């Protein structure tokens, strides 16, 4: 990242794949590189000046694209369904999942892109139950991208704790419903629940979210713990570990 | 209701519980409520005020969803380096080179001439005001 | 080893090549992100 000769704009994407795949001269590589400022090799007035010139030059260019002939850059706002979800959880081969994980990890370097990358990966959370072990890569990517505290706090501020809690409760209810009816054996039972509870523990371990988000999560933890304890036949080691973690969260959050 | 959400975000980003945060996470706070700043935006905001507590945090939010005529005049003065009120292609070129971003002379002439209504090949304050509205 | 046909870079060009590799990488990242934009 420290070797590039141009600096990509924070909130826009200038590359346009749809025109590039059609051999459009305006969307070529040289044309793209010509649209980016070179990487440059201070008092309050100077920073104010940079702010105003940047803002109003951007507005002028927006005019010139709106009325004139210069093309308009795409806005950095990622869609919630693409090929990325299909590739990231494919059961055909594991190397494809690993390669896609590496690609998306590399796609998130400047924080503006990390926004959308983290948001899309968080949106993909409900796929843990469907593709239990096949998500082992994606989890390892997700837990890798939020290893810093402020990203965890940002994700908490967007309401992921209720999301993960709802997913945990829904799949616990599915476990109870399955246990009531049939007697089959599944060797991947409890993987999604174990992963989700580990994720919740990671989110809560930081002090600010633990202090702030205790009042809305005690009910979910308590109900999940009781329903897990009610299990008597469809019990695996992962379910015991999940019960232990849930009890630990219950004990921790009930102090003060 | 928006003061409540701003307090919610500030408290959630409050690290030590004292109602005060650090400025290295200053960007992430309004970066989380849905607005997207740039690095120059961040540096201008931190320089204007500055460790931030709730009151000046509210003052910062007070001037974001709003453009004020004072800002347009300040931009016009920054562009008009010689201060004569007429933005020449040379001054535009200087400001774009200070930005580090590069154009040809033909393109600069083109954007200048498409910003003129009086046909004189020279933009002024009234044209700037009608442009930025 | 006696075959003749079997037996058929500076530092400035090396820095140039490294910078070009970084630029191409950035272009490919932008191209890949451009296909994930919502329609």
UniProtKB/Swiss-Prot annotation, chain A:
Transmembrane segments: none annotated. It comes from the Eukaryota. It is found in: Cytoplasm; Cytoplasm, Cytoskeleton; Nucleus. E3 ubiquitin-protein ligase involved in different protein quality control pathways in the cytoplasm. Component of the N-end rule pathway: ubiquitinates proteins bearing specific N-terminal residues that are destabilizing according to the N-end rule, leading to their degradation. Recognizes both type-1 and type-2 N-degrons, containing positively charged amino acids (Arg, Lys and His) and bulky and hydrophobic amino acids, respectively. Does not ubiquitinate proteins that are acetylated at the N-terminus. Belongs to the UBR4 family. The UBR-type zinc finger forms a pocket that mediates recognition of type 1 N-degrons. In addition to substrate-binding, the UBR-type zinc finger probably positions substrate proteins in the proximity of the bound and activated E2-ubiquitin conjugate to enable their ubiquitination. It is linked to Episodic ataxia 8: A form of episodic ataxia, a neurologic disorder characterized by episodes of poor coordination and balance. EA8 affected individuals have attacks of unsteadiness, general weakness, and slurred speech. Additional variable features include twitching around the eyes, nystagmus, myokymia, and persistent intention tremor. Inheritance is autosomal dominant. Component of the SIFI complex, composed of KCMF1, UBR4 and calmodulin (CALM1, CALM2 or CALM3). Interacts with E2 conjugating enzymes UBE2A and UBE2B. Interacts with RB1. (Microbial infection) Interacts with protein E7 from papilloma virus HPV-16, HPV-6B and HPV-11. This is E3 ubiquitin-protein ligase UBR4. It comes from Homo sapiens (Human). The chain holds residues 4040 to 4301 of 5183 of the full protein.
From Swiss-Prot, chain B:
Residues 65-133 are annotated as: Necessary and sufficient for interaction with PCP4. Residues 1-36, 37-66, 67-102, 103-133 form the EF-hand domain. The modification Phosphotyrosine is found at residues 86, 125. Gene3D superfamilies: EF-hand. The modification N6-acetyllysine is found at residues 15, 81. The modification Phosphothreonine is found at residues 38, 97. There is a cross-link at residue 15 (Glycyl lysine isopeptide (Lys-Gly) (interchain with G-Cter in SUMO2)). (Microbial infection) Inactivated by S.flexneri OspC1 and OspC3 proteins, which specifically bind the apo-form of calmodulin, thereby preventing calcium-binding and activity. Ca(2+) 1 binds at residues 14, 16, 18, 20, 25. Belongs to the calmodulin family. It is linked to Ventricular tachycardia, catecholaminergic polymorphic, 4: An arrhythmogenic disorder characterized by stress-induced, bidirectional ventricular tachycardia that may degenerate into cardiac arrest and cause sudden death. Patients present with recurrent syncope, seizures, or sudden death after physical activity or emotional stress. CPVT4 inheritance is autosomal dominant. This is Calmodulin-1. It comes from Homo sapiens (Human).
Curated annotation (Swiss-Prot), chain C:
Belongs to the KCMF1 family. Spleen, small intestine, ovary, peripheral blood, lung, kidney and pancreas. Expressed at low levels in the thymus, prostate, testis, colon, heart, brain, placenta and liver. Residues 9-22 have a biased composition (Basic and acidic residues). Induction: Up-regulated by FGF2 in gastric cancer cells. E3 ubiquitin-protein ligase which accepts ubiquitin from an E2 ubiquitin-conjugating enzyme and then transfers it to targeted substrates, promoting their degradation by the proteasome. Together with UBR4, component of the N-end rule pathway: ubiquitinates proteins bearing specific N-terminal residues that are destabilizing according to the N-end rule, leading to their degradation. Does not ubiquitinate proteins that are acetylated at the N-terminus. This is E3 ubiquitin-protein ligase KCMF1. Component of the SIFI complex, composed of KCMF1, UBR4 and calmodulin (CALM1, CALM2 or CALM3). The chain holds residues 289 to 331 of 381 of the full protein. Residues 6-22 are annotated as: Disordered.
